[PDB]
Amino acid sequence: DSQRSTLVHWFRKGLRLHDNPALSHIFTAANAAPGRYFVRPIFILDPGILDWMQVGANRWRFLQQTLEDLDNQLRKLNSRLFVVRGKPAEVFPRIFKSWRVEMLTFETDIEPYSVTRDAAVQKLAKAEGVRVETHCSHTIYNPELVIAKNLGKAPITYQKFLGIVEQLKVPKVLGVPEKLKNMPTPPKDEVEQKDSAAYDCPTMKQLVKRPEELGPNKFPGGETEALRRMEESLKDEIWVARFEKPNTAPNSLEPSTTVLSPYLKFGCLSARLFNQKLKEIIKRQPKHSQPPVSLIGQLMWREFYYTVAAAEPNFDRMLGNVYCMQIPWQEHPDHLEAWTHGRTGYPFIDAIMRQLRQEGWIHHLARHAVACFLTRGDLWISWEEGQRVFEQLLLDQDWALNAGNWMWLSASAFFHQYFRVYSPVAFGKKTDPQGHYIRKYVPELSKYPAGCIYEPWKASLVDQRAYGCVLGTDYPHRIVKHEVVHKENIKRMGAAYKVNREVRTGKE
DNA sequence: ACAGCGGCGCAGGT
DNA sequence: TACCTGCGACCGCTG
Numbered sequence: 214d215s216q217r218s219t220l221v222h223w224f225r226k227g228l229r230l231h232d233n234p235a236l237s238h239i240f241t242a243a244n245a246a247p248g249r250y251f252v253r254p255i256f257i258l259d260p261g262i263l264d265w266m267q268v269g270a271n272r273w274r275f276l277q278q279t280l281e282d283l284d285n286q287l288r289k290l291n292s293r294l295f296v297v298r299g300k301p302a303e304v305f306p307r308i309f310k311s312w313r314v315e316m317l318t319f320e321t322d323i324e325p326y327s328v329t330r331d332a333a334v335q336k337l338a339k340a341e342g343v344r345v346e347t348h349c350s351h352t353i354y355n356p357e358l359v360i361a362k363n364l365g366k367a368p369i370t371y372q373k374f375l376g377i378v379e380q381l382k383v384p385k386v387l388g389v390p391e392k393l394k395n396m397p398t399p400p401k402d403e404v405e406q407k408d409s410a411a412y413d414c415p416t417m418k419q420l421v422k423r424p425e426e427l428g429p430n431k432f433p434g435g436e437t438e439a440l441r442r443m444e445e446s447l448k449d450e451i452w453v454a455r456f457e458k459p460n461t462a463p464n465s466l467e468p469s470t471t472v473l474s475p476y477l478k479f480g481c482l483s484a485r486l487f488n489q490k491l492k493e494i495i496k497r498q499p500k501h502s503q504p505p506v507s508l509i510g511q512l513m514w515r516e517f518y519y520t521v522a523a524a525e526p527n528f529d530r531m532l533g534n535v536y537c538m539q540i541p542w543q544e545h546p547d548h549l550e551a552w553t554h555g556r557t558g559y560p561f562i563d564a565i566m567r568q569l570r571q572e573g574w575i576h577h578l579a580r581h582a583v584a585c586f587l588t589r590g591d592l593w594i595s596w597e598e599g600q601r602v603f604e605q606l607l608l609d610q611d612w613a614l615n616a617g618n619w620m621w622l623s624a625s626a627f628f629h630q631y632f633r634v635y636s637p638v639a640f641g642k643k644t645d646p647q648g649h650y651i652r653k654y655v656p657e658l659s660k661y662p663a664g665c666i667y668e669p670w671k672a673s674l675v676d677q678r679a680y681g682c683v684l685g686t687d688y689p690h691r692i693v694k695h696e697v698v699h700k701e702n703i704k705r706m707g708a709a710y711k712v713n714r715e716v717r718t719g720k721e
Numbered sequence: 722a723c724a725g726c727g728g729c730g731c732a733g734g735t
Numbered sequence: 736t737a738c739c740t741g742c743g744a745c746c747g748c749t750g
C-alpha cells in the first residue's frame with residue numbers, strides 16, 4: 214500500500230452522501246481501480262473561528278451533529294470522515310504532499326469567501342499537479358448558466374427567472390455512493406502518528422464554547438434527520454400539493470412549514486432530490502398550487518436568490534450593491550439592542566425574537582414581522598444590522614438567502630410596495646387570536662387577556678398588577694409608537710426612492 | 722416614449 | 736368564508 218495514491222473529497226457545503234456527484238466520482242473511481250487508491254473524505258475545520266461571534270451556539274450544535282452523522286454514513290461505505298483542523302491554505306499544501314493526493318473534488322459555492330478560497334486552492338493544486346473536478350449540486354440550476362442564458366445578466370424578477378430556468382436541463386439526481394471494495398485504512402500521517410484521534414469528529418465541548426446559549430434540541434443535524442423530516446413532510450400529499458406560503462401561520466406553536474431550510478443550507482438535504490420528490494407529487498394531484506406561492510415555488514425562490522447573489526459580491530450590503538436601493542438608515546444603538554433581545558415592548562415582536570434566539574428557527578412570516586419593524590416599519594435601522602443578528606441565531610443562516618430576503622423586507626430590492634407595513638399588533642392576531650405563541654415566549658405576559666396581550670400598554674396599572682406583570686418593571690415599555698412612526702417612515706421611504714430615481718435618470 | 726400590468730398590509734366593510 | 740375597496744401613487748417589464 215506504500216505505492217498508493219489518494220483521492221480526496223472536500224466537504225464545505227453538501228454534507229451528505231445522497232445526490233453528491235462530487236463524492237460519488239471518487240467512490241466509483243476507487244473501485245474502478247480497486248487497489249490503486251486511498252480515499253479520504255475530508256472536512257476542514259477552521260478552528261480559530263469557534264471563538265467567532267457570527268456563529269450561534271445552536272448552529273455549532275447543528276454542525277457537530279451533522280458531522281457525526283456524515284461520519285456514521287461514511288462508515289457504512291467502508292470509509293470515514295476526516296475532520297482536519299486548520300486553515301485550508303496551510304493544510305492543503307501539507308496533505309497533497311504527505312497523502313500523495315491525485316484528485317480533489319468538491320461542491321461549488323458562489324459566496325465571495327468561497328470563491329476566493331477555492332480559486333486559491335485551484336491555483337495550489339495546479340502547481341502541485343493535482344486534478345480538481347468540481348460539481349454544482351447545492352442548487353438545482355447553476356447560477357452561472359442562468360445568467361448566461363439571460364444574456365449575461367442575472368434576472369431581477371421572479372417570473373422572468375422562471376422563464377429562463379424552465380428552458381434549462383435539470384441534472385440527474387444521484388443515489389448514495391458504493392461500498393468501497395478492498396480499502397484498508399490509509400497509513401497514519403505525520404499528524405495521526407502523534408495523535409490517532411486527531412481527525413476524529415469534534416465533540417460538543419470542542420465546538421460549543423458557550424453551551425449556556427443552547428436551547429432545546431428541536432432540529433437535529435445531519436442527512437439522516439433531513440431525509441426523515443422530508444419524508445414525513447411529503448407524507449400528506451394533499452397538504453404539499455395545495456401549499457400556499459402566505460396562508461401558513463407564523464405564530465403556530467408547531468411549524469406550519471416543513472423546516473427543511475437548515476438541512477438545505479448545510480446541504481444535509483439535496484434540493485434536487487426535494488424538487489424531484491415534489492414534482493412527482495404534483496403530478497399525482499390535480500388540484501395544486503403553483504409558483505410563487507407553491508412549495509416548489511419556495512424552492513425556486515432559493516434558486517432565484519442564489520442566482521442574483523452570484524452576480525454581486527456586495528450582495529450583503531447597501532453600499533456598492535447594484536440591486537439595492539440607497540436609503541439613509543439611522544443609528545439607534547438602544548433601539549437595536551432592544552430588538553436583538555426581544556425587549557422591544559411589542560409582545561408579538563418580542564415573542565419572535567426570543568424563539569429565534571432560543572430555537573434557531575422562526576417562520577418566514579415571523580421573519581417578515583421582525584425585519585419590517587426593524588428597517589422600514591418603525592425603528593428605521595439598517596437591514597445590515599438585522600442580517601448580523603440573524604446570521605448569529607439562524608440554523609439555516611444563508612448568505613445569499615438572508616441578504617436577499619432582508620432587502621425584500623426593507624424594500625431595498627425585489628420588493629417596492631412600501632405602503633404595505635406590517636402591524637406588530639394586528640398581523641399576529643389573525644392566526645393566533647388567543648396569543649398562545651406570545652404566552653409561550655413572553656411568559657411574563659401569560660396571564661393577560663387576549664384583549665390586550667398584543668397591546669399591554671392598553672391595560673390600566675390596576676389591571677397590569679392584577680395580571681402579575683407591571684409594565685416598566687416586569688416587561689419593557691414599548692420603545693416606539695407604531696402608529697406615529699410607520700407613517701413617518703413611509704414618507705422617508707418615498708423620499709429616498711425619489712433620490713435613487715434621480716441618480717438613475719442622471720447616469721443615463 | 723411612457724402608461725398599463727402584475728407583483729406574504731391594514732382597516733373597514735359585506 | 737373569502738372576498739371587496741380606499742390608502743397614496745412604488746417598481747420592472749412590455750409593447
Ligand SMILES: Cc1cc2nc3c(=O)[nH]c(=O)nc-3n(C[C@H](O)[C@H](O)[C@H](O)COP(=O)(O)OP(=O)(O)OC[C@H]3O[C@@H](n4cnc5c(N)ncnc54)[C@H](O)[C@@H]3O)c2cc1C
Pocket residue numbers: 458470471472473474475477478511512514515516518575576577578580581584603607609610611612614615616618619622
Ligand atoms: C429576513 C429573512 C431572512 C431569511 N434568511 C434565510 C436564510 O438565511 N436561509 C434560508 O434558508 N432561508 C432564509 N429565509 C427564507 C425563509 O424564511 C426560510 O427559508 C423558511 O422560513 C424556512 O422554513 P421552511 O424551510 O420550513 O420553509 P418552507 O416554506 O418549507 O420552504 C421550503 C424551502 O423553501 C426555501 N425557501 C422558502 N422561502 C424562501 C425564501 N424566501 N428565500 C429563499 N428560499 C426560501 C427554503 O430554503 C426552504 O428550504 C429568510 C427569510 C427572511 C424574510
